[PDB]
Each structure stands twice: as structure tokens, then as C-alpha cells.
Amino acid sequence: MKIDILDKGFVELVDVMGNDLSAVRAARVSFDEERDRHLIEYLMKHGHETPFEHIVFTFHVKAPIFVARQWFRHRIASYNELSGRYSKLSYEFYIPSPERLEGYKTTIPPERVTEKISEIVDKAYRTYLELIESGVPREVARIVLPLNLYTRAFATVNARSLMNFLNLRADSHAQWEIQQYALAIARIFKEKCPWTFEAFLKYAYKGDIL
Amino acid sequence: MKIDILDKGFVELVDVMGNDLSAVRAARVSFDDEERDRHLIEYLMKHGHETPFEHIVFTFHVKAPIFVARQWFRHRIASYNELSGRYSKLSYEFYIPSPERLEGYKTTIPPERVTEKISEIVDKAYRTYLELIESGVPREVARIVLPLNLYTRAFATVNARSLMNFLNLRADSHAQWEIQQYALAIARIFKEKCPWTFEAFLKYAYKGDILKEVQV
Amino acid sequence: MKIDILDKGFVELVDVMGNDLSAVRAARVSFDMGLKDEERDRHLIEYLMKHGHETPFEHIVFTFHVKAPIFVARQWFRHRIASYNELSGRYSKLSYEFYIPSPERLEGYKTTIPPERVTEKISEIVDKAYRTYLELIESGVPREVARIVLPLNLYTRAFATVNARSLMNFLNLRADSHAQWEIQQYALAIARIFKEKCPWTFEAFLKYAYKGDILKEVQV
Amino acid sequence: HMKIDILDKGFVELVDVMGNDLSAVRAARVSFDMGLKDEERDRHLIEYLMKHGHETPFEHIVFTFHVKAPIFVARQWFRHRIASYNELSGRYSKLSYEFYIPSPERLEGYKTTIPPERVTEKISEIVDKAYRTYLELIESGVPREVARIVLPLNLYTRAFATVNARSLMNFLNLRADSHAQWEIQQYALAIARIFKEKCPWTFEAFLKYAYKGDIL
Ligand SMILES: Cc1cc2nc3c(=O)[nH]c(=O)nc-3n(C[C@H](O)[C@H](O)[C@H](O)COP(=O)(O)OP(=O)(O)OC[C@H]3O[C@@H](n4cnc5c(N)ncnc54)[C@H](O)[C@@H]3O)c2cc1C
Ligand SMILES: Cc1cc2nc3c(=O)[nH]c(=O)nc-3n(C[C@H](O)[C@H](O)[C@H](O)COP(=O)(O)OP(=O)(O)OC[C@H]3O[C@@H](n4cnc5c(N)ncnc54)[C@H](O)[C@@H]3O)c2cc1C
Ligand SMILES: Cc1cc2nc3c(=O)[nH]c(=O)nc-3n(C[C@H](O)[C@H](O)[C@H](O)COP(=O)(O)OP(=O)(O)OC[C@H]3O[C@@H](n4cnc5c(N)ncnc54)[C@H](O)[C@@H]3O)c2cc1C
Ligand SMILES: Cc1cc2nc3c(=O)[nH]c(=O)nc-3n(C[C@H](O)[C@H](O)[C@H](O)COP(=O)(O)OP(=O)(O)OC[C@H]3O[C@@H](n4cnc5c(N)ncnc54)[C@H](O)[C@@H]3O)c2cc1C
Ligand SMILES: O=c1ccn([C@H]2C[C@H](O)[C@@H](COP(=O)(O)O)O2)c(=O)[nH]1
Ligand SMILES: O=c1ccn([C@H]2C[C@H](O)[C@@H](COP(=O)(O)O)O2)c(=O)[nH]1
Ligand SMILES: O=c1ccn([C@H]2C[C@H](O)[C@@H](COP(=O)(O)O)O2)c(=O)[nH]1
Ligand SMILES: O=c1ccn([C@H]2C[C@H](O)[C@@H](COP(=O)(O)O)O2)c(=O)[nH]1
């Protein structure tokens, strides 16, 4: 299960432990679909969130660094990222579509903004390559690369922390770019925990876009 | 997978996400080579790179006396749901130490008498408790007369890194004996589900003294 | 500042870092600003509380000294975003101190035996259990074993260091009628100290963010 | 009140502190049912706790720092999850013309086919062209959160950081170390220096008994 985002990003489901019944078992402390769903909706509406900590996901995420800096602020989660200190860094950058500037009345066409973003990326990356080849250590050379460079990370997160993430990122105050990643997270979450996700939306979800 | 502990306790594995390779994929950042993979497990553990191990997660169902659970729930990087005394009527189950538990200390009465003395008050406390329940005292007030050796039950979800920390501290002769026994059972399950992390852990990172002595 | 709770319990404030302005200072870094103004700083607090920006309140930290029955400590220490150090029954000979509810503890429940009888029966097992504990000790039973006969209403003591965001989560859950009465009492006194040290943050919390019921009814 | 300048334009500034060495003694002492004693006993205890890896008592010493750092430093630093951060937002403010230019001497030990000064120059040029593109996009009405994506990782950011002594010592183990990138090591040197000033006994004990790095 993989969902492409932005121009070259994605979120893939790597692994999941448990399902809706995992929260049910924990809440009951032990080990009829209408009784179990009812308990899920009961916990969600009253803010009993701890039973949801026993459903856990691991995602593999390709995201621009500026999205990843916002993402990694969520501290109740586990991350492992590619090191730019050690990997020769890929020619992969997020270039916004022209549609990204809809509703903004701009001096220069959205199409020239795009072009201006990609030119800097191109000159930054080429300066970076000039630096490597002359023997500047990678850890120094990449400091000239722009914030739209793509990075990759594994994110392991339980469903409670995943719901707090969606409260803050599946919402129109979050930067658009991370909203799109948040939508994808929600979709995988829905697939894997339909009852939890459905109760989340009804009783506890604080954002707007979902 | 279920292991009896003490007189009435147990450690039961409810669930696991991942195995040794889940730490490897996370260190490499790759979704999709035994010798090499094992070599890396060893490498991360040798050089203190412990984050990749946070991507293996266990859920245990644990039954233990409250004095043991209070030591255990002090480990905060973990998720707990415990049987509520406020809401459920509590079962006549109490940890009563073996005389084998005190043999090793010089006492002035036979350990048989320690067993009978402990059993005695458990019995009187529990009766007072039931009398209070029956007479209409809410359970959450009636249970405060119950002694610390009352058995409780919890689901614990914990990643392998935090589990290793748990083992450093609880799988060790400095820890109270009762919880050591629970740690041995946690270790055994860990060893079974992640043999490469476990051996690498014992070789490089483990700070305690029992798991190097006592098999599994 | 020391507030007495229950018959022998207390919440004492050991230390505080920062005050309301700590949070303003922290929030202002986002907009390339420092401290700005004595009344613009208060409004920024309301604003943060109103829109759910909780991170700046992490920069206010308290250390409390708390004496409380184990059954209360057990519920309290469930709050994982905090630091605790507790009196150890493995290494210390525990004192004769136990929470004996007063007869008024049973207001609103029909009982079968009078409330002072309930109080009496609680005292009785407490005195039995503690005698045994002492008999066990005298006999050479190590403390870590002897104490397992002691009841849940035994008082214990702990340091708790906890930031204002986490302490607001604690008030959400514990200064509320769904939480057990005894810990409610403790959450009131915690509320009183938060309020004395962080009055702006505290007023804003009650008005915009607080989910419990009792602090809107019960002064301070 | 303390302030230490790091790199060409960065700093570490102590904003506030809660407690001191005795804060840990006090918290530790509660366990044995004791309190503060003489200077000899209390110093001895701090050393004892550090030797045996009893680190919970150090959680009761707290620091607030105000740090100015290039994003590539702050991105590593922010991986330390047991801490609180508030940072300058590229979403909401006009970012300043401030970037870390490595000095010529940063390249000591590497044979370069371009004199270190020209490296320095090349980094300045690219940074300048980026910042000009950023300003031009802002002036033309491109939203700040978008225009800034062209800015490089050597751009200076600002943050407040609140962190307890235990998590501070973990940060020192990992960043006060030659395996860590030079730039973060420098910030770590600043952090350690202030830690030392405010909690001398703890710091000495940490250095002698628990500190895992090589540069302190
Ligand atoms: C629209 C929006 C604009 C924002 N702008 C800014 C900005 O200007 N500056 C900035 O620095 N960041 C900003 N952020 C980041 C945001 O404030 C948090 O850093 C991020 O959302 C993580 O939230 P969290 O702490 O709830 O999640 P996590 O860190 O994953 O924590 C999860 C939950 O655990 C609790 N918690 C965890 N750790 C602690 C702790 N140490 N103390 C107390 N409670 C804790 C909280 O209840 C929290 O909800 C912004 C976020 C969004 C969505
Ligand atoms: C009225 C009420 C009745 C309850 N009855 C029960 C019961 O029957 N059984 C029982 O076991 N317990 C019960 N509790 C305890 C409850 O389940 C919580 O453990 C406790 O209240 C602490 O709440 P917290 O997790 O919000 O606080 P903390 O554990 O301090 O966490 C605070 C915040 O940090 C975040 N957070 C921290 N760690 C994690 C994590 N690992 N994953 C995701 N998010 C995290 C959350 O956002 C949370 O808001 C009860 C509590 C109350 C108030
Ligand atoms: C033999 C022994 C005797 C002990 N006696 C006492 C006693 O007398 N009194 C007492 O109160 N407790 C005592 N304990 C409990 C002990 O102090 C620890 O709280 C417990 O062992 C869990 O330790 P932890 O913090 O490593 O685990 P967790 O809480 O799971 O934390 C795991 C890891 O996360 C980090 N971490 C998590 N939260 C924080 C934080 N808030 N700040 C900084 N770093 C953090 C640490 O690096 C830690 O190793 C005893 C434990 C043992 C094993
Ligand atoms: C020289 C070096 C090279 C590195 N290269 C890489 C790389 O390629 N990729 C990469 O992603 N990062 C890398 N890092 C970052 C590293 O993986 C950690 O994210 C960072 O060092 C934070 O360490 P920490 O998690 O121990 O500290 P914190 O995250 O603050 O945690 C402090 C302590 O609390 C405990 N703890 C906190 N949260 C949890 C949890 N959820 N589960 C279990 N235990 C917990 C641990 O005991 C930990 O030691 C590198 C770091 C260094 C120093
Ligand atoms: O020494 C390092 C190397 C990597 N990382 C983490 C921080 C980033 O989130 C990610 C990539 O860092 P760079 O290697 O790109 O600096 O890994 C560190 O914290 N320290
Ligand atoms: O109101 C409550 C009820 C329970 N618990 C937690 C504490 C224990 O870990 C467990 C059982 O508590 P009692 O219900 O036995 O008090 O759940 C609370 O934190 N608050
Ligand atoms: O070996 C120990 C000793 C103490 N504690 C913690 C748990 C309780 O919060 C408090 C009291 O524990 P006892 O000494 O009563 O077991 O200290 C432990 O976690 N492990
Ligand atoms: O919507 C936001 C805005 C900011 N931040 C955090 C992430 C960074 O650590 C810091 C600045 O991010 P930017 O505003 O530069 O994205 O604040 C977020 O997490 N989400």
C-alpha cells in the first residue's frame, strides 16, 4: 500500500501491529461486532485514548525536508532517516505545480515561480556537485542544498499519536504540502482500522479537511 | 506463548510487529542477506545506534502483584492498560511467597510461619473488603484495605529498545526478585521473536548480571 | 507553599522555573519577536490557549513534593510525561501512616452499616496489617517482602517535576468528577499552586482549554 | 544569563534554570526517606548515582536555552525527542539574510583542488542567489511558506529548548563526540560549558563516570 504525494513523494505502509480489536482487547484487558464497535465509539467520545496506543504502524515516507522538519516535531513516534552526511544526495527536489498558487494574485505568473524554484535547485545542486568533486566532504557540501530536497524516513507511530498528528496536519492551518501527506496517512489508517477511524471522525477529530 | 511466574502470575504475548529485519530495514531506510543483516544488528548494538530497534514492537498481557506492577509502570516509554479497581470487583488472588523465597535469610521463625502469617492477613483484608462491598461501600473506597500483593493485570505495548532498557534494569540481581522473574519471561519471549537483536544485546549492550548466567 | 490533603497528605511546591512570560517568550520566537508588552503578553497567552498552541507552555516547569496514599500515587504516576522519585519500600522501613477516610467520605451512598463502622473496619485491618509487617521485619524478613502485606492506603512520598502543558493534561483528567474523589483533592491543590505561580496561563486554561468540570465551580 | 557564540553567527544562550546539583540529591534522598546532609555526603551521592546509572534524579534539573543555528544543525538537534522546542517559523516570518559560511579552516585535512577560500566563496554565491530568489518571490506575492523552499540548509534558525539534565547528558554523549558533525560538536561544547557552570558536581561526575564521548 503506497500513495504518491506531491511530485516525487509517497507514503507506503511498511507494517502494522493489530487492528480495531487490539484497542478493544486492551480496554477490556483480555487475551459480537456491534458490542466491539460500540466500545470503540464509547472510548473515542469520552477521550479514553490509551487503548489506541496498542495499534501501531510503520510508514516509509519520501518527503521534502521542509515537510519532514514539521513532521519530526511529533515526538511520540520513532524515526530513522537517510543521512545526507553519508549518502551522495539524489537529484530529487519538490517543484510546486502552478496550481499551488491559486487564489494568490502574483506579479509573476505561477509558471515563472515554478521555473524560478527549479533554476535555484539546479544551481544549488550543481554547486553541491562542484564541491564534492573538488574533495569538500559531503557533510559540508550539502549545506548549500535547498529545503525542498527529498529525504526518506521510516516512521513508527501508534494510533493515538497518529490521531494527534491528523488533528494538527489534516487541517487547513497546516502547510498544504504536509496536509497531503496527512491525507494519505488517514487513508492508510482508514483501511487498517475502519471502526477506529470512523469513530475518530465523529467524536474526536479536531481538523477540517477530512 | 505464555509463561507462568510466581504462584499466580504470567507473561503472555499478545502481539508482535516485526522481527530482527525490521530494525535492519529501518537503519537502512529500505522497504524490500543473513550474514550482512546480522552483522549490522551487531554493529548498531556495538556502537550504541539504538533507534532502529524502536521499530520492533511487542504487546504483552501481564498478570502480577501490585508491588511488582508499581515498579514496572515506572517505565514510561510504553503503553499500559490495567484492570480498574474502581470499576471491577476484585478477585481473591494474592501473591503468597514460597518458604523457598526466605530460605537464604536468617529468620527467627520457620518460613512456613511467614507464609501462614502473610496468608492470614490477606485472608482478613479480603474479607473486610467483601463485607464493605456487600454493605454498599463503593468498590473504589472498599479496596484501599487490600494489601500490595493483590494481583493485577495489564496489557503492555513496548518497543524493543525500551524493552532492552527494561531488561537492563529488571533482569538484574539488584532488582527485587519477583520482578526479576517477570524480566526473565520477557527476555525469553524477546529471544524467541528477535534472536539476533537478543544475542547482540547480550554481547554488547546488556548492563545487568542474570541474562548472561541463566539460559534464555 | 504546602497544602494539606486528606488526613495526612500534602502537596508542597519545591521549585518552579519560569512564569507566564516564559510562554510568551517561547511563542514569540515563531514571529521573530521577543517580549513585547505587559498587556500584549497577556493577550498572547489567551490567544495561544484559545487556538490550542500548547508547546509554549512546556517552558514552565514545577517540582512538587507530594505525600499520598499508594492507590493515589498509582493513578498519578500513570502520567508518563513527568519525572518522579518515590520513597522506596524496598530500602526504607515504612512509617505507620494510612489514609482513613472520614465518615463524610460516604455522602450519597446508602450503606448497611453506619459510616463510622466503615471507618472502624478500615482502621482495624490497617492496624492488623501493620503489626504483621512489623512482626515480619523483627523476624528477619527483608523489607521488600514484609511490606507486601501493607494496604493500598499506606502513604508514600514522591518528587514530581512536570511542565505546565502536562500539568494541564493532569488537571483535565484529575480535576474532574470522573476521577476518584481522593485524587480530585490532590488535583485542586495542584490547581491552586499553578494558579498562584501562573495566573494568566491558568485563567486562560479555565476559559478556553480545560475539559474537566470542578475547577469552573470550585474556587481556585 | 549566559551567552556563547558558535560558528560565524550562531549562539547558545542560557535563558533560565531550575534547580542545581542539590536538586538531584534531594530527589534521590526521598528513596531512603532522607534529605539534604553535609557537603561530603551529598557530593558522594551524586557520584554514586552517576556510577550506577541511577539517572532519574537528574531529571529534576531543568534548563531553558535560546539557540541560533543553521537548519542542518537544528534538524539533527531536534531529533532529541525528550525536550521541548519552539522555533522561528519560515511559514510566518520574513527570514533574515543570515547563513553559515564555513571558514577556510573548516576544510583542514582535506586535499581540495580549489583553495579553501574559493570553497567559502562558492558557498557565499549560491546562498546569495538563493536568498535573492526568495526575496523576489516574496515581493511578487508568493506566500512565505512556499518562497522559502529555495533557501539552503545553512540558513540560521532560532529556537528555545527546554531540557532536563538527564536528557542533556544523553545529548552530550551523542553530540559531544568526534563521530558527530563538527558544527554540532561546537554547539554541544557550548551546552556542556553552561551545564558545567550550573551543575558542577553533576558535570564532573558525568565526565568521570558516565560520559561516553571523546571531546569533553
Ligand atoms: C498549523 C501549525 C503551526 C505551528 N507553528 C509552530 C511554530 O511557529 N513554532 C514551533 O516551534 N512549532 C510550531 N508547530 C509545531 C507544533 O507546535 C508541534 O511542534 C507539533 O505539532 C507537535 O505537536 P505535539 O507536541 O502535540 O506532538 P508530539 O510532540 O508527538 O506529542 C504528542 C502529545 O504528547 C504530549 N507531549 C509530548 N511531549 C511533551 C512534553 N515534553 N511536554 C508536555 N507534553 C508533551 C502532548 O499532549 C502532545 O499532544 C506548528 C504546528 C502546526 C500544526
Ligand atoms: C477518569 C479516568 C478513569 C481512568 N480509568 C482507567 C482504567 O480503567 N485503566 C487504566 O489502565 N487506566 C485508566 N485511567 C488512566 C488513563 O488511561 C491514563 O493512563 C492516565 O489518565 C494518563 O493520561 P495521559 O496518557 O493523557 O497522560 P500521560 O501518560 O502523561 O500522557 C500525556 C499526553 O502525552 C501523550 N502521550 C504520552 N505518551 C504517549 C504514547 N506512548 N502514545 C501516544 N500518546 C502519548 C498524549 O497526548 C497525552 O495527552 C483513567 C484516567 C482517568 C482520568
Ligand atoms: C534496582 C532499581 C531500584 C530503583 N529504586 C527507585 C526508588 O527508590 N525510587 C524511585 O522513584 N524509583 C526507583 N527505581 C525506578 C527507576 O528510578 C526508573 O524510573 C525505572 O527503572 C525506569 O527507568 P527509565 O527512566 O530508564 O525508564 P523509562 O521511563 O521507560 O525511560 C526509558 C528511557 O527514556 C529516557 N527518558 C524517558 N523519559 C525521560 C524524561 N522525562 N527525562 C529524561 N529522560 C527520559 C531515558 O533515557 C530512559 O533510559 C528503581 C529501579 C531499579 C531498576
Ligand atoms: C553521530 C551520529 C550519526 C547519526 N546518523 C543517523 C541516520 O542516519 N538517521 C537517523 O535517523 N538518525 C541518525 N542520528 C540521530 C539518532 O538516530 C537519534 O535520533 C538522535 O541521536 C537522538 O537520540 P535519542 O533518541 O537517544 O535521544 P532522544 O530521542 O531525546 O531520547 C533520549 C532517550 O530516551 C529514550 N527514548 C525516547 N523516545 C523513545 C522511544 N520512542 N522509544 C524508545 N526509547 C526512547 C532513549 O533511551 C533515548 O536514549 C545520528 C546521530 C548521531 C549522534
Ligand atoms: O550525525 C547525524 C546524521 C544524521 N542525523 C539525523 C538528523 C536528520 O533528521 C537525518 C539526516 O541528517 P544528515 O545526515 O542529512 O545531517 O538523520 C543526525 O541527527 N545526526
Ligand atoms: O481513575 C483511575 C482509575 C484507574 N487508573 C489507572 C491506575 C492503575 O494503573 C490502574 C488501576 O487503577 P485503580 O482503578 O485500581 O485505582 O488504572 C487511573 O489512573 N485512574
Ligand atoms: O527496585 C525498585 C524500587 C522502587 N521502584 C519505584 C516504584 C515506586 O514508584 C517506588 C516505590 O517502590 P518500592 O520500593 O515500594 O518497591 O519506587 C522501582 O521501580 N524499582
Ligand atoms: O506549520 C508548522 C509550522 C512550524 N512548525 C515547526 C517545524 C519547525 O521546527 C519550525 C519552523 O517550521 P517552518 O515554519 O519553517 O515550516 O516550527 C511546524 O511543525 N508546523
Side-chain angles (χ1 to χ4, degrees), chain A residues 72 75-86, chain B residues 26-27 29 48-52 54 77 159-163 165, chain D residues 76-83 85 166-167 170-171 173-175 177-181 184:
Chain A
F72 291 19
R75 294 162 286 177
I76 312 297
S78 296
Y79 303 102
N80 274 274
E81 186 170 356
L82 279 173
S83 189
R85 290 192 69 206
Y86 296 115
Chain B
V29 194
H49 303 305
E50 328 196 76
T51 60
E54 313 182 3
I77 318 300
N159 70 48
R161 179 180 201 180
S162 167
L163 193 157
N165 184 74
Chain D
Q76 296 166 6
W77 189 324
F78 278 48
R79 299 295 304 284
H80 296 258
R81 295 161 287 179
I82 299 166
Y85 302 93
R166 172 178 197 183
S167 175
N170 188 65
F171 176 92
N173 286 347
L174 302 166
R175 316 307 183 158
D177 193 76
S178 57
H179 299 104
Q181 171 157 347
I184 212 177

Side-chain angles (χ1 to χ4, degrees), chain A residues 143-189:
Chain A
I143 73 174
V144 308
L145 296 172
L147 280 166
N148 70 347
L149 211 219
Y150 275 95
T151 185
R152 286 193 288 112
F154 272 40
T156 293
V157 60
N158 71 44
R160 171 178 203 182
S161 174
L162 191 167
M163 286 181 305
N164 169 69
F165 176 89
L166 296 168
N167 288 329
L168 304 161
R169 312 298 185 167
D171 177 81
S172 85
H173 298 87
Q175 176 149 15
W176 186 84
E177 277 87 6
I178 202 164
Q179 293 173 37
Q180 298 298 289
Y181 283 87
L183 289 176
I185 297 295
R187 182 65 155 86
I188 295 158
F189 185 39

Side-chain angles (χ1 to χ4, degrees), chain B residues 70 74 76 80 86 117, chain C residues 78 82 84 86 135 178:
Chain B
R70 266 177 69 234
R74 290 295 305 281
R76 299 156 288 175
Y80 304 96
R86 297 191 57 205
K117 274 176 158 249
Chain C
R78 288 304 302 281
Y84 302 97
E86 185 168 357
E135 279 160 15
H178 298 82

Side-chain angles (χ1 to χ4, degrees), chain A residues 69-70 73 169 175, chain D residues 78 87-92 148:
Chain A
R69 260 165 85 238
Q70 301 171 174
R73 288 288 303 274
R169 312 298 185 167
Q175 176 149 15
Chain D
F78 278 48
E87 180 185 344
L88 208 212
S89 165
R91 281 193 77 208
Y92 306 120
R148 56 66 179 271

Side-chain angles (χ1 to χ4, degrees), chain A residues 1-30 32-210:
Chain A
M1 199 167 189
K2 181 173 172 192
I3 294 157
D4 296 327
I5 331 278
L6 310 185
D7 48 352
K8 310 165 184 95
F10 57 78
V11 170
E12 42 185 7
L13 183 58
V14 176
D15 211 353
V16 162
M17 169 179 80
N19 57 34
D20 293 320
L21 298 183
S22 291
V24 175
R25 280 190 197 81
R28 278 187 191 142
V29 196
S30 218
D32 191 351
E33 306 216 359
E34 274 188 303
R35 247 163 219 234
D36 295 338
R37 280 201 82 173
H38 191 254
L39 217 214
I40 280 155
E41 311 214 314
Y42 179 88
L43 303 164
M44 200 65 74
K45 114 171 77 163
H46 286 117
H48 308 345
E49 283 164 49
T50 58
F52 304 102
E53 301 176 26
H54 312 263
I55 298 149
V56 177
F57 301 78
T58 302
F59 295 104
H60 178 214
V61 174
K62 183 177 189 181
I65 292 184
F66 73 88
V67 162
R69 260 165 85 238
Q70 301 171 174
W71 200 318
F72 291 19
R73 288 288 303 274
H74 298 258
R75 294 162 286 177
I76 312 297
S78 296
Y79 303 102
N80 274 274
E81 186 170 356
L82 279 173
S83 189
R85 290 192 69 206
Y86 296 115
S87 333
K88 180 209 164 193
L89 282 158
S90 304
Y91 184 57
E92 290 200 285
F93 296 86
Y94 168 60
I95 308 310
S97 64
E99 291 74 45
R100 181 70 179 78
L101 315 162
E102 279 189 329
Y104 293 95
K105 305 206 272 162
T106 62
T107 274
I108 92 174
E111 297 84 22
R112 279 281 283 184
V113 184
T114 294
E115 191 180 328
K116 280 157 192 294
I117 301 167
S118 27
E119 165 212 356
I120 280 299
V121 154
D122 190 71
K123 306 193 159 160
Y125 179 67
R126 284 161 39 241
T127 299
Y128 165 70
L129 292 183
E130 288 177 16
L131 298 176
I132 302 300
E133 293 154 12
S134 102
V136 168
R138 300 177 200 285
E139 82 181 4
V140 166
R142 63 49 188 263
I143 73 174
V144 308
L145 296 172
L147 280 166
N148 70 347
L149 211 219
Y150 275 95
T151 185
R152 286 193 288 112
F154 272 40
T156 293
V157 60
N158 71 44
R160 171 178 203 182
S161 174
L162 191 167
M163 286 181 305
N164 169 69
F165 176 89
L166 296 168
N167 288 329
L168 304 161
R169 312 298 185 167
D171 177 81
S172 85
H173 298 87
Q175 176 149 15
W176 186 84
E177 277 87 6
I178 202 164
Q179 293 173 37
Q180 298 298 289
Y181 283 87
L183 289 176
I185 297 295
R187 182 65 155 86
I188 295 158
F189 185 39
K190 185 165 178 176
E191 201 62 40
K192 287 291 168 209
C193 303
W195 298 341
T196 305
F197 183 77
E198 180 76 329
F200 179 53
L201 280 208
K202 270 37 200 288
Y203 299 121
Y205 168 64
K206 287 174 67 69
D208 47 8
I209 80 163
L210 303 180

Side-chain angles (χ1 to χ4, degrees), chain B residues 70-71 74 170 176, chain C residues 77 86-91 147:
Chain B
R70 266 177 69 234
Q71 287 167 16
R74 290 295 305 281
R170 308 310 194 167
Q176 191 159 347
Chain C
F77 278 46
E86 185 168 357
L87 172 75
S88 176
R90 290 192 73 204
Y91 312 114
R147 57 64 183 274

Side-chain angles (χ1 to χ4, degrees), chain C residues 10-37 39-100:
Chain C
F10 58 72
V11 165
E12 189 177 23
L13 181 77
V14 178
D15 217 346
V16 191
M17 186 180 64
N19 50 46
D20 296 312
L21 290 183
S22 305
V24 169
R25 199 215 289 116
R28 286 269 176 56
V29 81
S30 303
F31 308 95
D32 228 333
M33 331 203 276
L35 302 145
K36 246 197 128 200
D37 178 14
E39 81 254 27
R40 274 190 179 87
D41 294 348
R42 177 164 203 182
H43 177 56
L44 179 47
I45 270 159
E46 283 204 326
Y47 176 101
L48 297 165
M49 213 59 80
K50 175 150 67 177
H51 302 99
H53 297 244
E54 302 172 74
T55 64
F57 300 95
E58 302 187 24
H59 303 287
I60 309 165
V61 192
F62 296 82
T63 303
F64 300 99
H65 180 215
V66 178
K67 167 167 169 195
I70 288 179
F71 72 93
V72 164
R74 298 200 71 227
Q75 292 169 359
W76 192 321
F77 278 46
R78 288 304 302 281
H79 295 258
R80 290 159 295 182
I81 313 285
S83 296
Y84 302 97
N85 280 76
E86 185 168 357
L87 172 75
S88 176
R90 290 192 73 204
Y91 312 114
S92 266
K93 192 166 86 77
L94 303 159
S95 324
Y96 172 85
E97 281 198 302
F98 292 88
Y99 161 60
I100 306 302

